[PDB]
Structure formats: structure tokens, C-alpha cells
Backbone:
């Protein structure tokens, strides 16, 4: 019948001193809880294995590297995959990826989709990196993603995960219609990812009180206009003196929010998902083939 | 000058037999009221000179042709232009455009921008035509725009209207991120247009109660993600037995709705507009040149 | 830890010819589904055993009486109670109650709370009856609740249901702050009920497009201002030619909608409920004892 | 006359040393701008003449006293009244009222209504005082209103202001359904006031990201359920190192927001107001006399 139960595993803060073993325990706990509630897939936050390190300027490269994964899964994260396979619940995990290619230490803000058999189905590397590249004194806390990561090199793919077409986005990506549209054009039925969104923005603080609004607006508009179910898992709460936005959510292809977290701690929410619901949009008001006039969208792709 | 006062002139229903002279009287009234309240520009609905004729299945070309404009403006509509120049308030007027080229008729769902001097400074032709192509007996009312209009051939231009960079969308266009983005990439500070949106949709009636939601969601998301002020003028009310959506609105570049109509009759709303407000988005979170990666958006422009 | 999983069992239309046995099958199905997802309690709609008969004017008293329950549970509804006890999931059921007292045939729009042991814990009879008392020709469909029911005679009680303080409201009641406040003052941690809300209102059709908005606004404001979790189960869809509002929901004590249905058919939604969350409001911004000045609210209770 | 144009004059921060003369200049500017745009009444913030002093723990009564008004208006504030009479635009002004009775000081958080003739036609004193009573060291800023003000002693009156029945609320009051209902029962057509709402709350910081939501939710629900136009004027921005909420608004009796500010500085918004619109609610769904059952609301007035 093409139905399933989707879950979002919101994370509370992760301390700089908090170990990966300790984080995995928290992830295993949420995954198990989701499974008990019938979930077949659970979405975890962006960079969900450590504290959001981009908030600090590093001078020691060994220290910076400590926040990156060189294996996936490694012995420490392995338990999550084993449990996922055991309980038959896939997941989307975000983490910092360090890979050496041709003499270059490549760093990506990454996310992976694992199916209900514990097998990695696909990867995505954050294409829209927000923030800045150089330390900025006027900021109460940094957001050096442009310094610690390079734009993703995998485009915006859509993978078959347990009979569901799933596309991945990572945090800031959710605000760009292009990311949603490319995956929408690739037939995504579910577009999911996580985020680390401070409720304070140094560059434009006059938008602080609109942090939730902008986050939900992006999720709802993206889902609706592409007729795709969506889910966003944030890492929220006061993490290392920086308040992070909560309001993790699951959204229907109509843009209707069907599930929303209300705490700023580890929290699991779930919602029944009918993949055929996407047709109400993609076969009608948003029947791409019947209505789109791409001959007029060229500027969007100009370099 | 970077400050101005924008207005929206929502229309109540226009009867099948209501003359353009009578409609012009209503338009003049709203333009006059808007100017008295400081507005120097007012947005009117899509096809603001006639009843929404695409709701009927025509069998006589002469009857169909009667709903189109062969000149803009003709003697009947000219008074609106004269008053706009007198009071110093430009406008966006929607209408059905009939052009005869070498004995061949061309039909467009059109909108024009007139500056505070009463001069036409730009035209746009609806690119995204909603509805169906053939008569469908089950529908209480049809929506045969695909038959009565050709997709626009002017692309999504942005024009300078009295020191303001303005782009035009027409009804359905507002639901397509591509329309907004093209104009966003062309630097539009204001994106505006009108609409005739029935609160009932025959093919997907399960979205009827979401009519306001989808409309406002599209306007808010479009404004926010392109950092553009926006305005949507609807023709609402029970027109020829078909209930049309109201909730005409003016929206800030943050996506915040600053003005909204509450009736289903002719109604004017105004909002102070600072063209520099756009910078809060376009020079930061949505600084296009700094964050976009167009090399990965190619699929959006593929035919 | 004072936690539980609350569910809402939205109903699709119930035909005039649809039997109670057939309705009970649908209710049993949702209750079972909820239980499988970990729900300890499920809220069903107002008058959930029959079609919304108040929409018709009856001349035959025997026919009117056919829609009322004279027993609760009777042999037909008994299965629901048995299953509730089996699976350990309580519920809130709405139905038309007919009881003869002192020679008077009393009719109430009623709802009952049954605990996880299948035992009826408390009853509530609708105090705010909307609509009219006499047949009204100008209406496309009637809403004769004032004719078929008499205002409830049990006040707005709050009962202990499996260690949770629960208050009941029935449809229109949710729009009156007095109903919420009385139960709020009685310590309700969960305020729940169901509804039959046509998306069309004959008296004031200009509010039709606001049906969802007003319903959700009432649920959110009631929850927030009383620091109570809440849930509303509607019977939606096209029932006997009258479209009924969907958007069944579960709301947190902060007023945040945590679960929302998206179809207009039988649909189950669930949300984790922490009764202590009520304290975030009732012990602070809405600490009644510390902030209320009842010496100034007298007019609210004047006859 | 049943038509008018209502305005809201939102204030940006008022410094601790900013004089009343300087504040009056800002108020005159907004009143003048509002009138030029057709407004015949403008709502100003709570304590609109000084910085929000309740944020500090005072130890000197003379310093505290300096923030209160001993006369209304005194020579400094009089110019505002004169301009209101000149331009024909009344206003709602909030301020700290200090009264000396038989050698005894009485302190109130007050608001007055002045008609378009510049005459004071009504007064209200804040009944719901938020915050705490004793100094709390952990808080970055205090909120000692319970110490610097006595709960209002005028109840929730409704006054006739230039053919409009208006009621007053002050900040926190807007979150209490009782305040709105009393004025609703007294027939208010417009319920207005101002507010100083920090976007951060020390005791319950987990609701910080919901500050706008709770504010707007309270205004929308209050208007809808009492069928009253409403307006809330906030003093927003970073005032003395404390960020205050913006989103000043004008709301229709349907609960629909018709105007909203987007900056955190002095800002004027206006909306056309039809006093008869109230009837859409008060003569139908919320026809008090026809639907209310006050005999069951007694608990709300119990001391
Ligand atoms: C900094 C914030 C604007 C950005 N955060 C992120 N992790 O990508 C976001 O778009 O959520
Ligand atoms: C029919 C409706 C869906 C469509 N109306 C329109 N005039 O384009 C719209 O997009 O508003
Ligand atoms: C008719 C509608 C206004 C009313 N319906 C109801 N069943 O009580 C309601 O308040 O939901
Ligand atoms: C402190 C805040 C919660 C309160 N402020 C206020 N001035 O009354 C308010 O209710 O807006």
C-alpha cells in the first residue's frame, strides 16, 4: 500500500567534552523508542556525533580533525547500525567527513541514508555552506562552515531506500528552492535532513524572533511545491553557550506540519506516511511535465 | 529614494455582463483611495477588467473574444491611466490580451506595470497556466486557461518602475519557485501580481480547506527566499456562482505578511515599503553570489 | 514519570444508512492501530456512532430517536469497550444520549471518558449548543442542535483517568474560553473532545475559508492559556452532501500543535504526552493563584 | 459613523536617560504620520514615556519615582494632546502613574484613551502584573512589576471614544481570556493596548523561540472569540541591553491579522476599521445572549 511510519530523532545539546560513545547511547535510545512506536525510518540531526564545532576558530589542526569521522561506521558508531538492522529501522545520520584524496584532506558536512537492513544506501554532502570563512570578531560565536567544509560534490541525489525515494538536505540547504526542486525533479517522495540553527544570528539579529518561522516556512514551502513528505531533525537547546533552534518536524506533501517537537532535548516524533499522497500534488496542481516551462528557467542554472 | 507606500486593490466579483466602464469606476475608486492614504503604487487582480471567463466552455469565438483587450488602454480604460498620472500612483493591471499577427490570433493572460506618470513601463504574460485542456462534464465550473491562453513569451522580466525594481507574476505563477527565482536573480525588490483562485478544486477537493494556506505559504516563501517585498491582489467573492479566494496581501522580504484583506469585496490595503530592507536577506543568508552553486541546478533548466 | 501516548481517531463520513455495527468496526480498527503505536488513550469525534443527524429537520419522532443511544455500552458498542480493556487503551466517545426522567425525554449531545480498563470514568453533556431551533429555509443544510439537544447539566467536570486529569469539551465548546477556564481552574492536564464542523456556514459564509484557522486558533489558545495538553477529533469529509472539516489535532500546553491529520478519512495520529509539561505555564506565566484577580471577573458569571 | 482608520505607533527602545521631551518628539512624529495616512486613532505602547524600568532592582525611591507621571498631561506631554486635537486623531498612551493620597503613594501601570479632540475619555490600570516580587540574582534582567505597581482598581472598563466602543488592556493582560471577555461583555468594538515583552524569559527560557507565537496567538484568539477589532503596540528593540518583542499588530474581529510591523524601531501601521464587522461574530457564532450559559461559569469569578 506504500505506507510507512517516519520518525525524527531530535537531539538535545552535545557538549564539547561529550564522547561519541555517549552520543551513540542517546541515538540508540531514540532509535529504539521510534521502533517501538512503529517507525521504519528515523531522521537524526546534522553533525549528530559531536558538538557544533564550527562555532569556534581552531589553530590546532589535530584538534579540528578530532571532530571528523574517518570511517562510517567505526567501532563506536557500529552499534547504531547493528540496532537499526535488528529492529528494522533505517536512518539518516549527519556527521563531519574527513577523506584524503590525491594529497588533499577533504572535509565535508555529510549525511547518509541507511536502510532497515543497516546498509548504507546513499550519501550526500552539504552544498549550501552558510556562515563565513574567516574569524569574525563582532560575532558572539562563529559559524565557520565555509572554513571547515567544502561544498558537496555529489549534487542532490535521490535514492531508493526500502521502496521509498528519499532525497537528502543538510540544514541551510532547506532554505534554497533549488535543492528541493532538483530532488523534486528526481522524483523524491521524502526529503529529509537535520540542522544546527542558532536562534541568534550576528549578521542580522533583527530576524532572531523569526528563527522558527523561517525554518518552518522553508520546510512547508519545500514540501508543498514539490509534493514531497519532509522531515527536519535539529540539535537544539543551549549547546556550549549557544541556543539552538528546536521545532524539529515532519511535513506532508501538502506542506501541512504533521508532527512537531516541543522540547529542546532528545525527542522522538513520528507520523504515518503514505507515499501515494504525493500524487495529490505531483499529478495535479504541480504536475511538472504538464505545467513547467523550463525554456524560461535558464537563468537559475547560469554560472 | 528608497522609500514608498505600496497598495493592493482587491476586487470583489465582476459579473459576466458587468461592463469595463463599470469596472473602471471601481478601479478608479480604489486607486483614488490608495493615493489618499499615501500609496504611490497599487496592484490590481489578474484579469481585472472582466469576469473570470475561463470557467466556461466556449463554443463561439466572438463571445470568447469579447473578454479580451485589443488595445491598452482603449477609450474605456484610459481614465484609469489619466487618474494614475494625476495622483502620482502607478499600478499593475491584469487583463486578457488578444493580438492579431498576420491574420493569426494570439491570446495571453497579461499584466502590465504603469508608473506614477501613467506610462506603461513593462509587460508580463502568464507562463504557468493551471487547469485542464478539454471540457470536463463533472466539474461545477471549468478552468480552461490552457485553451484560452498561450504560455507567456516574455519570460520573467524585472522592470524599473519609479526607482523600484519590480517583477510580475500572475496567479498560478506564485506557486512556482522558478518564477520567483528568475526575478530574484534579476534583482527584483518588489514581486507582485493578482489572482482568481476558486476555494474549491474539482480534481482535488481534499485541499479546499487549505486554499488560504497554500496561497499565503507561496507568497511568504517566495518573498523570504528571494528577499523581495511582494503583493498579491485577488478578485474574490461569489463570482458567477464560484467562490473565489480573498486574503489579498502585502509581504515583507522576510516573508512576514504586513497587510491582509478580510472582506471578499473591493478592498484596499497599504504598507510602507523600504526598498533597502531587501538587503537583510540578499546581502546575508541569501547572498546569491556568495552561497549559490548553480553548477548543480542544471536539472531545473532541462527541457 | 507521568508520561503517556495520546491518540486521536479522526473519522471519515458516516452515512445515514451506515449501521452502528459498521461504525464500531471502524472505531475498533483505529483503536487497535493506536494501541500498536503505543497509545494509552484515544479521542474519538462528537456523535461518533451515526451521521450528523442535526442537519435534517425531522417530523417523525421515532426516526429522530433512532440516532440516540439508550444504553452505553449496548451490545453493539460493547466490543469497543472490551477491546479498550484488552489493549489497555482508554478513550473518549461522543454520542447522542436519550434518557427519560420524570416523564421527560431528555436529549443530550454527550461524551464519555473510559479508562484503560474499559471502565467509564466520567460523562459530559454539551453545554454550548450551536445552530438554531427552528427549520431555516435559507440554509442549504440545517444545524438543529438547539432543537435536538438541551444544554448539558453536568457543568465542565475534570476526571481522574488513569492518573491523568482530563476535561471534556464537545465541538462548539472549544470556541468558548469559559469552558476551557473552568476545567483549567479544576486542574485539567488534558482537555479533549471531538467535532462536526461543516466548512460552510450559512449564516456567515464569508468566514468559510477560515474554518480551519478558527478551529486551530481555538485549540491552540485554549491549551496555551490554561497550560493544558489538548486534542480534537473531528468527523470529516463529504458526509451526506455536507463537507466536514478535518485537521484533527493534538496540542501541547504551550499551544504548539504536535500532531495534525491531513486526510478527510478515518485517521489516527499520536503524540507523546508529559503531564508535567503543564507546569511550564501553570507554575509561571499562568500561575493562576499568583496572577489572577477574580474580584474583577464577576461580569463573566452574571446571569 | 461606523468606519474609521486605526493606527499603531510601535516604539523602538527608550534609553534610561532619554527625556520625556525626546520621547514626545518621537510620539508626535508617529501621530502626525498616522494622521497623514487617514488614521483617526493611534495606539502607543505600555509605559511609552520611559525606558522599561521594572527591569532593575531599585533601592532609592526618588530614582524610582522619577519614572512616574504625577500629572497627565504635564507641560512636557501636553504638545502630544494639542497635536492630536489639531489633526483629529485620538490615542492610547501608556505610562507609570504615581498618585499621592493623604500622604500615601499609589503606583499603577496605566493607559488612557484620548479622543480626536485631545480629551481624556477613559483610564485603565493594569490588573495582571507579570514577573516576580523579590530580587532574583540569576536573572540578566528583572521584572519587578509586582513591586513597583499595585493591581489596577478600575476593572476592565469600555469607553466611548469618538463613536467607537473601546476597551484597554496592558501588556500581560492580553494573555488572560478574562480581561477580553469582561470587555467583550461590555460591548467593546475595539480592544487595544501596548506591551514590553522581552524575547527572553529567565524562568522559562524554553519558550523564548515562541515569544512572537504566544503574543500573536493571544491577540488573534481574543479578537475572534469576542468579535472585536484589536491592536497591540509594542516597544521593541535592544533596550538597555534587553531585547524586546516587535510584531506590533492590528487584528480583525475574526482574529485575522490585518497589519503587522517588521522592524524593531518606531513604526506606524494602519488598517481600515468597520465597527459593524463585529456583528459577524457577535450576532452569530458568538451571539453571547443566545449561546452562553453563565450559570456554569461561576468558578471563574470565585476568589
Ligand atoms: C546558521 C543558520 C542560518 C544555518 N545553520 C546551518 N547549520 O546550516 C541554517 O540555515 O540553518
Ligand atoms: C485554479 C487555481 C489553482 C489557480 N488560479 C489561477 N487563476 O491561476 C491558482 O494557482 O491560483
Ligand atoms: C456549526 C459549527 C460552528 C459548530 N459545530 C458543532 N458540531 O458544534 C462548531 O463550533 O464546530
Ligand atoms: C514579561 C512578559 C511575559 C509580559 N510583559 C509585560 N510588560 O507585561 C507580557 O505578558 O508581555
Residues:
Amino acid at each position: 500500500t506504500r505506507q510507512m511510519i517516519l520518525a525524527v530523532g531530535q537531539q538535545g545539546p552535545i557538549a564539547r567534552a561529550e564522547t561519541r560513545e555517549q552520543v551513540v547511547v542517546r541515538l540508540l535510545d531514540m532509535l529504539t523508542k521510534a521502533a517501538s512506536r512503529g517507525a521504519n525510518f528515523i531522521v537524526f540531526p546534522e553533525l549528530a556525533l559531536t558538538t557544533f564545532f564550527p562555532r569556534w576558530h581552531f589553530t590546532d589542526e589535530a584538534e579540528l580533525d578530532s571532530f571528523y569521522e574517518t570511517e562510517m561506521p567505526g567501532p563506536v558508531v557500529r552499534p547504531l547500525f547493528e540496532k537499526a538492522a535488528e529492529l528494522g529501522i533505517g536512518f539518516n545520520l549527519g556527521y563531519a567527513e574527513l577523506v584524503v584524496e590525491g594529497g588533499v584532506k577533504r572535509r565535508f558536512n555529510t549525511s547518509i541514508l541507511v536502510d532497515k537492513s543497516g546498509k548504507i544506501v546513499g550519501k550526500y554532502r552539504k552544498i549550501h555552506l552558510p556562515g563565513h570563512k574567516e574569524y569574525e570578531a563582532y560575532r558572539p560565536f562563529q559559524h565557520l562552515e565555509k572554513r571547515y567544509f567544502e561544498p558537496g560534490d555529489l549534487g542532490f541525489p535521490v535514492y531508493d531506500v526500502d521502496a521509498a525515494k528519499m532525497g537528502m538536505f543538510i540544514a541551510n540547504d532547506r532554505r534554497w528552492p533549488e535543492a528541493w526542486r532538483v530532488m523534486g525533479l528526481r522524483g523524491a517522495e521524502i526529503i529529509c535532513g537535520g540542522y544546527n540553527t542558532p536562534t541568534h544570528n550576528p549578521p542580522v539579529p533583527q530576524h532572531d524572533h523569526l528563527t522558527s518561522f523561517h525554518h518552518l516556512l522553508s520546510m512547508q514551502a519545500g514540501s508543498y511545491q514539490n509534493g514531497a513528505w519532509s522531515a527536519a531533525a535539529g540539535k537544539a537547546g543551549m549547546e556550549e553557550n549557544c541556543m539552538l533552534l528546536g521545532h524539529s518536524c515532519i511535513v506532508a506533501p501538502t506542506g501541512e506540519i504533521v508532527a512537531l517537537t516541543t522540547t529542546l532535548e532528545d525527542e522522538v516524533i513520528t507520523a504515518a506516511v503514505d507515499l501515494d499522497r504525493c500524487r495529490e500534488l505531483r499529478e495535479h496542481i504541480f504536475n511538472f511535465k504538464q505545467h513547467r516551462q523550463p525554456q524560461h528557467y535558464g537563468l537559475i542554472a547560469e554560472l
Chain D has one domain: 1-303.
